[PDB]
């Protein structure tokens, strides 16, 4: 794939209750594009969690540079554990969809 976004860390483990923040970095070439945050449900069915531009427990925040983005689940629950990714959709010039590698979130029990 050409100029895909990266999604990090590949493995993020948090205690239930905390916030969990991923970093999706996309260096866009010509800004007619949208970024989407996905969670992969049973046997590869994708669920859209949020999208930039535009549940409130899933927040996407654009950082000062034109590359880095913060995707955070607020107060992660045990069943937030799963597989996530970010996809970049360039609308023009020349339509193209590029996904990141999959990252795993693990939410552990509080003591």
């Amino acid at each position, epitope marked *: *794939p*050409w*100029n895909p976004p990266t999604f990090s860390p590949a493995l993020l483990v948090v205690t239930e209750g905390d916030n969990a923040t991923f970093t999706c970095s996309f260096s866009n*070439t*010509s800004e*007619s*594009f*949208v970024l*989407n945050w996905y969670r992969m449900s049973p046997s590869n069915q994708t669920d859209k969690l949020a*999208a930039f531009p535009e549940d409130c427990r899933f927040r996407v925040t654009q950082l000062p540079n034109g590359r880095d983005f913060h995707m955070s689940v607020v107060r992660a629950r045990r069943n937030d554990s799963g597989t996530y990714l970010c996809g970049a*959709i360039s*609308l*023009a*010039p*020349k*339509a*193209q*969809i*590029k*996904e990141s590698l999959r990252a795993e979130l693990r939410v552990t029990e509080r003591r």
Partner: antibody, heavy 125, light 113 residues
Framework: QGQLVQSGAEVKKPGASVKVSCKAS????????MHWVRQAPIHGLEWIGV????????AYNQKFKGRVTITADKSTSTAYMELSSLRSEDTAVYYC??????????????????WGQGTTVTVSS | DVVMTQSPLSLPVTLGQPASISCRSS???????????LEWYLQKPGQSPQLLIY???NRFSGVPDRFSGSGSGTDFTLKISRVEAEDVGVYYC?????????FGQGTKLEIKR
């Protein structure tokens, strides 16, 4: 391949709005983007904008950005195109045209392999 | 915006003879991925435009052998080896490497009688 059928001719007063549709058949709708292109003698062929059906994302030519809205209904394989604040110079033929979305499974090197038949919009008092 | 200029604007040609249309871009139209999305479209009279040539020199499916494209930098050319009757209409070059996407102004190919 596949097909694109657009709504019939339209006539509107200066300052009104028009909404023209574009129905797809014979191919997978979400595998493609839908562009809109204008053709008039004073203007030639000019690109208006594009929509990606799945995300609803749109990109517009700065010339029309602010008075054009492009929408798509994936369930009915129909794209739409709404021009507001019509001027006499908006009189033209309006085409919709698909573009293959490059993915990791498929690469598209071309833009407009299938076009609608065109929709005539006349703006006059 | 990248301005695409065609030459000539009217092309009368005798049946069986070659034809040539020039397209010039006001700047480079190399895409950020390295590809040059220069295209040639033909609008037969009373019909919609149809794709002839993609990516500077690649012939689209169903397009006859006699059509060919070439170019480099800002200069591109469409060649017809032997003009046939079904080849009349308006020819447009198009660039898709920069937003906004722009077409040339058109070249009307007519039969010289």
């Amino acid at each position: 391949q596949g097909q694109l059928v657009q709504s019939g001719a339209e006539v509107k007063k200066p300052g009104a709005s028009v909404k023209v549709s574009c129905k797809a058949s014979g191919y997978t709708f979400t595998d493609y983007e839908m562009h809109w292109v204008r053709q008039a003698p004073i203007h030639g062929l000019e690109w208006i904008g594009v929509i990606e059906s799945e995300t609803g994302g749109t990109a517009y030519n700065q010339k029309f950005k602010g008075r054009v809205t492009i929408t798509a209904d994936k369930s009915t394989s129909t794209a739409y195109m709404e021009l507001s604040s019509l001027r006499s110079e908006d009189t033209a033929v309006y085409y919709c045209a698909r573009e293959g979305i490059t993915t990791v499974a498929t690469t598209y090197y071309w833009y407009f392999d299938v076009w609608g038949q065109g929709t005539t919009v006349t703006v006059s008092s | 915006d990248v301005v695409m200029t065609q030459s000539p604007l009217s092309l009368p040609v005798t049946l069986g003879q070659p034809a040539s249309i020039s397209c010039r871009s006001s700047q480079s139209i190399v895409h950020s991925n390295g590809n040059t999305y220069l295209e040639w479209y033909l609008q037969k009279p009373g019909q919609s435009p149809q794709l002839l040539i993609y990516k500077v020199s690649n012939r689209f499916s169903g397009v006859p052998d006699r059509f060919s494209g070439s170019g480099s930098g800002t200069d591109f050319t469409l060649k017809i080896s032997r003009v046939e009757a079904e080849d009349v209409g308006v020819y447009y070059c198009f660039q898709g490497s920069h937003v906004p996407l722009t077409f040339g102004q058109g070249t009307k190919l007519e039969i010289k009688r």
